[PDB]
Symmetry: D2
Subunit: 94 residues, 4 copies
């Protein structure tokens, strides 16, 4: 598992960051609920920058997508990034 993904897995699932980034209820996507606080408070700790565009570009490079309504709270999804599915994470690729 690439370091970025291992750090992302830990970060999403950590209860100490859930006020800003957390799994969805079923774990098949994850939410960043306050992008500005996330980029200033959380991204420094785990990725040593504060640039939300940069983090998003790295998600894009691993194939993550965005979840939006059919008709701030941003929601990301990757088919192989699912809470608890540790072995499935090995299928995320650049």
């Amino acid at each position: 598992v690439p370091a970025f993904l291992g750090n992302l897995w830990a970060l999403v699932g950590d209860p100490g960051t859930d006020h800003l980034i957390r799994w969805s209820p079923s774990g098949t996507s994850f939410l960043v609920s306050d992008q500005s606080r996330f980029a200033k408070e959380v991204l420094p700790q785990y990725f040593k920058h504060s640039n939300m565009a940069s983090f998003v570009r790295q998600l894009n490079m691993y194939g993550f997508r965005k979840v939006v309504s059919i008709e701030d709270h941003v929601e990301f999804q990757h088919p192989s990034f699912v809470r608890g599915r540790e072995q499935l994470l090995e299928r995320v690729r650049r």
Copy 2:
């Protein structure tokens, strides 16, 4: 499980429809690979009409979302609609 969801589960999971509507590799979302052909050919088999707008409105009413690139086919997701998670399907609500 409301009949809409049971029908949708069967439609998505049916190998015979996978050329037009299928689970994602991990089963946490589903893909419609061509909306016009899907509505004409496969929608009636399971839903007995051919109106894509009606179908998508129902998805919206059950809380489905779309999955789009971070930056014709469509991908839909619901936290409680996951391949194999039959009991979880009981949590999808209007």
Copy 3:
């Protein structure tokens, strides 16, 4: 996926065999609820023998285990044989 496992996956999940072999409610194990009928009616169709000991030996060769009470209905489990987890099935090995 080895043919035996592909056939086993299809067999367990098939609604037309659920009266004799079926997934548990959450799909993390599966049950054979009438071993004699299963071996006489189901195993011929899918594995061209009627020998429950043989089928069990093949499960044992792929690392399947039995689920029993802490203190007929036989229940089998393999960590990588889970309803809906199609990609995980690729990790079952002899």
Copy 4:
């Protein structure tokens, strides 16, 4: 979620206890790798007693089963106790 199950979920999932109690690779069962040391060392941390018999009786009362070879460590399973399946845990009942 009853306190027993919340404590068990935390105990199993804690990396700091994985040398004695851990999820299986796929998370559909959990393993206790040495019962005597587990009861003396790690059980009190999460349950505040050191009585393996009491703990196993509680597992039985919540419907947990053992996973054994088809033919000292122990492996326990419950259809509704699955790594990452937080909502499913609400289905475990006394």
